[PDB]
């Protein structure tokens, strides 16, 4: 219950559409593979953010906390 939080993921979640670096994306997708919480369909990785805890939000943010071709 923290609109601030959700309002925080609102950026990445959206900007995620502008990101196409097959390097960073493919590297993040490998993370959600560990937590074990997603759904594979067709050719798109569909997963919910509000479904995961915070400890994961600060982690997935890793790629967004430092870009510049890694």
């Amino acid at each position: 219950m923290d609109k601030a939080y959700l309002d925080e993921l609102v950026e990445l979640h959206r900007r995620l559409m502008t990101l196409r670096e097959r390097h960073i994306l493919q590297q993040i997708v490998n993370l959600i593979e560990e937590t074990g919480h997603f759904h594979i369909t067709n050719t798109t990785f569909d997963f919910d953010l509000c479904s995961l805890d915070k400890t994961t939000v600060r982690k997935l943010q890793s790629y967004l906390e430092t870009s510049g071709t890694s």
């Binding site: 979640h13 097959r22 994306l25 919480h37 050719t43 798109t44 805890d53």
Partner: protein
Amino acid sequence: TTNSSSNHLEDPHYSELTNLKVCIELTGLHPKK
């Protein structure tokens, strides 16, 4: 792995729309091997 889980069953709430969800098209990243 084969068993872990971390979330299941929740009080009657939430909704289909507005729930911050992502969709990464694997059509872009397809490096040969």
